[PDB]
Design a protein around this ligand. Structure first.
Ligand SMILES: CCS(=O)(=O)c1ccc(NCC2CC2)c(-c2cn(C)c(=O)c3[nH]ccc23)c1
Length: 109
């Protein structure tokens, strides 16, 4: 059921926000600050920005019909990271660690 699936989504996102994963999830907590040194071309490369606070807000405001729509937004957050940054960047290695947390939880629900 969609209602049940969406409560599991809330649970998944709550684990991604937990202290257990903090050392590598913290650059994904809030939207990317495009007024920070570098990132002057961030809006030129990233057409659809996404972060965990935006996904949390979209869940609370019922903007997802089902788990797949929630999943698409989490994956957009990681794909934005893989598209923008060099593959050797510290943030890419952090995104891969947080995505492993996500994929394992999302797959078992
Ligand atoms: C919480 C939003 S923030 O603006 O405070 C912030 C702070 C630190 C960050 N990275 C720190 C770096 C790994 C050591 C990032 C960041 C996120 N993402 C998703 C990228 O793609 C990216 N590229 C370059 C920087 C970033 C964002």
């Amino acid at each position: 059921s969609h209602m049940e699936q969406l409560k599991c989504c809330s649970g998944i996102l709550k684990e991604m926000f937990a202290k257990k994963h903090a050392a590598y999830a913290w650059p994904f907590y809030k939207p990317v600050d495009v007024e920070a040194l570098g990132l002057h071309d961030y809006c030129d490369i990233i057409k659809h920005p996404m972060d965990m606070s935006t996904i949390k807000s979209k869940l609370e405001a019922r903007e997802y019909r089902d788990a797949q729509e929630f999943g698409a937004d989490v994956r957009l957050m990681f794909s934005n990271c893989y598209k923008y940054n060099p593959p050797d960047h510290e943030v890419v290695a952090m995104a891969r660690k947080l995505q492993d947390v996500f994929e394992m939880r999302f797959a078992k629900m």
